[model samples]
Target: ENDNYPIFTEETYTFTIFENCRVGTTVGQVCATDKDEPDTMHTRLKYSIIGQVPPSPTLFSMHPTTGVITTTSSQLDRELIDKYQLKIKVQDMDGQYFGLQTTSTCIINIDDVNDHLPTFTRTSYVTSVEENTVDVEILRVTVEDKDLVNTANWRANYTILKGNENGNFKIVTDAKTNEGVLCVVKPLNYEEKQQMILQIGVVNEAPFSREASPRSAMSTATVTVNVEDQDEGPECNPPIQTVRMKENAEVGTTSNGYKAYDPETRSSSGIRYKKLTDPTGWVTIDENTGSIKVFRSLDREAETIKNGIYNITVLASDQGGRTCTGTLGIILQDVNDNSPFIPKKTVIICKPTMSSAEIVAVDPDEPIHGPPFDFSLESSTSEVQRMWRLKAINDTAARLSYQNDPPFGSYVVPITVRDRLGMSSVTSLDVTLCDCITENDCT
Candidate 1:
């Protein structure tokens, strides 16, 4: 009969299901109807999968009575086959050989499932990097995995498992080839270690559906990194070294310079020193020996001296253009080097008054050691002392007076002044006994 054939509701069917799903999972259902009669074999429909695009050994099954499709195999990989084409057959006579039947196309799309771990293509890698460097690329690694492209199951994640306790090295996934790129994050010290052994591991971005332990279960590789030592520079500890010296010392006084040592050898060899700072150009250093010597006379009263301390810097440099600087501080002790002396050049006395003005002494030493002078005449004979008498005025000065009115003539008076520290000086004063209107006027 013309009405004996089964008719499909849609022309084609497309369904999506996750890969690695359990067997016997219902994929989808395909239904058809026959117009011949009701409640009979001619009216009832049956379904069967006629053919598959990838002629494999029976991966799907169809129900004969309900027209339902289900998976028969559990090992479904999306990377191998992402989509499957099925030819579904619907018959009116329970899928008999001679029954009226028509075929329809059905698309089965396979979704990805994270079931495999990424594997490193190589077991070991080698690279050499310069020491005392950071933020540089060292090596790269590639991984092989069977998963969908650009998906979580295929995206790679890298980690450093060992030998990076100081966070000196880090690994990140390369977006171009999904590779692991190893880089130096912190500076590496060659004196600490010549070679570093690192264990790097790779895994998928998505966790494994079965294991689910991303950190514990991973494919690893070994990386051997050799650090080449760049010539280490000089280092200085206790940056400021000090020495005590008396001010106004001899011009050639010498002292030990600041100390600097190489980091690698811990010795001062192959190093040269230079003066970086000398406020008054007061000091010089031996270039190779680092010995400090006074270039010029130093004064404690110099404007450059601060709080009785003079500072200068010495720079120590190595062959590799690396340098370290330290301050050479000199603590100057004040010494009694200057003697007391009269400031005025001449003295005038009035013949009518028979007295001279007061005179003062000036000493270059500090006030703590330079005051309270003993004024006396230098002459051993008594004529100069008896003619001009010296009267006490204060601790630092004296009044020059005459015991007798001498003749109107100028006389040279040699006066001796001594300081508190027993330092002495002499000054010859020109004394004129003149008849004038004032003590300072000589007319």
Candidate 2:
């Protein structure tokens, strides 16, 4: 009653399969109708999948009598193969001998599920940037998603999770490349922080699927930025330093105290000091501590010392070959180092008080041996002390007279002169016991 040829629709059948489908899950159904009467070989229709475009015949199965499609294996990843094309056939008599069969193309489309996570191209990124840099690009961060491309699920969004407490940096996404560009928003100071650690997180624009684990929602990457050190000049602690020391400061002894340090962080190298200008070779500075010491004995009364003040120029240098200058002022205080002495080595004194001769003491030091001075005879013999007793006139002048009118002879008198600072000098005065009336006769 039925014709020998079986009629089948020429239209392509398309089915959708959600990725990761369970085994034996029905994905789609296919139908083929035969025009012949029922209960006969021509009316009974049978369906089967002959060949697949992927050549994997075990992945899909169809019912022979009913045209139903199901997954044979639970392992199905859209990321690996998004769609599968099958060659399906329908037979009139359950594919008996001489049965009519028709072939049609069945396309299976795999719907995407958020089963993949965003992953960074690298685990960590590192870069070096100069200090004090502002609004500059530091580095780029790239990520990849195994899901469908050009969709919200594959797009990546970046955020800074940590290490930017001061808002020094920001992350921007590149629309063209879908990469994160790390930029410095504020200035970086090498002295404050030498290194920065940034923890960056990447997530898709679309939320993860409910089936996806919470831990796979986002991925983290570490960015390490090293702040390069800039050369900075050395600075003195007090800027201008003044030191007070005695005139007779010993050599190789530290007198002026000072310290030089670089404005950079302690990670920088040590500072060195050099004597730029020292008019007199009387001082030396320690290169390590910038401490000044006496190279030789300092003299307040020296011709080179001006008003008891000495000015020195010192240079402080860093390892980067940068230098800074500082002034060191030294004030040499005066001390009682000079003894009082008479200008004339020998003095002639008239005897018997016939004529008085004035003897004056001269000292080159300031506050010269003055008003409060004591002069006395320093002869060892008791006869000399008894013969001559000194009389105090003014501080600079003294009167020498005979103790008694004795015989005419030569006598030697030793005198000791003292100053206010307990400084003394010894000198001898010659006196002739000559009998004279006028001052001209005692020559």
Please name the candidate that would achieve the greatest lDDT relative to the true structure.
1
Model 1 misplaced stretches (Cα beyond 4 Å): 2-4, 9-12, 33-42, 52-57, 78-85, 93-98, 210-215, 232-239, 243-249, 259-270, 297-303, 317-324, 333-443
For model 2, give the RMSD to the true fold.
19.1
Q: Which 10 consecutive positions of candidate 1 have the poorest summed lDDT?
A: 209-218
Q: 256-351 in candidate 2: lDDT tens per residue?
A: 444567675543247778888878889888887677888789887778778878878788888778777777889877776866676665444545
Q: What would the per-residue lDDT of candidate 1 be over residues 261-304, giving only the tens digit for each residue?
A: 89778898878899998778888889888888987888876667
Backbone clash pairs for candidate 1 read none
Positional deviation of 6 in candidate 2, in angstroms?
A: 3.7
